[PDB]
């Protein structure tokens, strides 16, 4: 029972600054070190820095030594990472983790012992404009599914940047959900689909609503999906 909650996705123009929060829970904030890492698409983990929640002292990596600032709010128990002078090289998923146990004797700041991770924060640094999504319902089709079951969904069209999240019935519906990876179109915009396999008999009586969240553009859409007619 330990959970690190990071801030939502962000879009930034080149040269701006970004501040990501992380609120750990289920343990004592000042007992363990906080580490900051990132994943640039195609590449792998890159350690950025560490912070002592008790004292506030921080150390950064060499390539980030002027650009990063790690702080904390002990009153609410939240760590913060600020990265400046953004470029396309900063486009990545940003993680905060737990480090070693904090002791008066011996330094454990540099122990790569990351037990708990944040969910991630996707940064896209680009001069392009933030595009909100159009949402369309994909009416139930029984043609290609398994037995007395049909398939319906949502088409989330033409947005930027990544990501969008899709849920169903405000999170009540999780069974049989497949949210597909988005395509990067030649337009420069993303599109994805979310498909649910539901029982055929329950149509007309069961309600199917997809909840599309695109935080970079501050858009929430709740699309009702019901059968068609002819």
């Amino acid at each position: 029972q330990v959970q690190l909650v990071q801030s939502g996705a962000q879009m930034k123009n080149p040269g701006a600054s970004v501040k990501v929060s992380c609120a750990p829970s289920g343990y004592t904030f000042t007992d363990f070190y906080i580490h900051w890492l990132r994943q640039a698409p195609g590449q792998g983990l890159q350690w950025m820095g560490w912070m002592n929640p008790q004292t506030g002292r921080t150390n950064t990596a060499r390539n980030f030594q002027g650009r990063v600032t790690m702080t904390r709010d002990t009153s609410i128990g939240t760590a913060y990472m600020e990265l400046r002078s953004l470029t396309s090289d900063d486009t990545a998923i940003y993680y905060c983790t737990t480090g070693g146990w904090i002791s008066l004797y011996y330094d454990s700041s540099y122990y790569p012992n990351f037990d708990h991770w944040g969910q991630g924060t996707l940064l896209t640094v680009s001069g392009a404009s933030t595009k909100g999504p159009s949402v369309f319902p994909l009416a139930p089709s029984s043609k290609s599914t398994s037995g007395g079951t049909a398939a319906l969904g949502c088409l989330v069209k033409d947005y930027f940047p990544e990501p969008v999240t899709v849920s169903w019935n405000s999170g009540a519906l999780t069974s049989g959900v497949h949210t597909f990876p988005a395509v990067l179109q030649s337009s420069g915009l993303y599109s994805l689909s979310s498909v649910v396999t539901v029982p055929s008999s329950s149509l007309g009586t069961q309600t199917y609503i997809c909840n599309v969240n695109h935080k970079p553009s501050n858009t929430k859409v709740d699309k009702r999906v019901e059968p068609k007619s002819c």
Binding site: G44, L45, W47, Y110, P112, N113, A151, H178, F180, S191
Partner: protein
């Protein structure tokens, strides 16, 4: 950055080893190396730490070692569930941490899955917004290589197709999607539009017609 191989392949039941080579000042003179697991689309998981030690909950099939300037992660009793990206992280000097480039583990002997294909026609709602999009969803196929083609009636369509590259599913199989962009007049003018999906010698063709 520590050096790891790009990919490592192994058959089920076998034992495989992933390397992580740094210098004397990091992995050479310190026993401070941890390993992490990452399933596609997911958050990294604590697998090994301090070269040898396992956190609680981690399978005993994972074991670490170290010689000179090289760490090693060893998986015994290899399974499909071990197919992932694996990373090593070590003390790097001056109270810093350094990470490796990662390694994709492939489990051979893995059989074959036929693709499931679902084709949605444009919605009346998109049609009213003076746009049309055909949605082809392909899933549960293995290996992860597929070609998608679209057809208007019976002649090929290549204009406005936008197809994804296959991505690893959670059940070790693959998914993909293709999108035919169209005008309402085009959608109505034709008897049908088809998404045909070819996967290792076999082809599935799904077809929709205007109402």
């Amino acid at each position: 950055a520590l050096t790891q191989p790009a990919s490592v392949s192994g058959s089920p039941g076998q034992s495989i080893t992933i390397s992580c080579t740094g210098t004397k000042y990091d992995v050479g003179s310190h026993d401070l190396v941890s390993w992490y697991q990452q399933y596609p689309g997911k958050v990294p998981k604590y697998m090994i730490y301090e070269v040898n030690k396992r956190p609680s909950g981690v399978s005993n099939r994972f074991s670490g070692s170290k010689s000179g300037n090289t760490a090693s992660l060893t998986i015994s009793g290899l399974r499909a569930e071990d197919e992932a990206d694996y990373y090593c992280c070590s003390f790097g000097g001056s109270a810093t941490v350094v990470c490796g480039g990662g390694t994709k583990v492939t489990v051979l002997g893995q059989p074959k899955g036929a693709p499931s294909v679902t084709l949605f026609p444009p919605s009346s709602e998109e049609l009213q917004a003076n746009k049309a999009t055909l949605v082809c969803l392909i899933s549960d196929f293995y290996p992860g290589a597929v070609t998608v083609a679209w057809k208007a009636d019976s002649s090929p369509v290549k204009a406005g197709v936008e197809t994804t590259t296959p991505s690893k599913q959670s059940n070790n199989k693959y998914a993909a999607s293709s999108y035919l962009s169209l005008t309402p007049e085009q959608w109505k003018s034709h008897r049908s539009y088809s998404c045909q999906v070819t996967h290792e010698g076999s082809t599935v063709e799904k077809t929709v017609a205007p109402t």
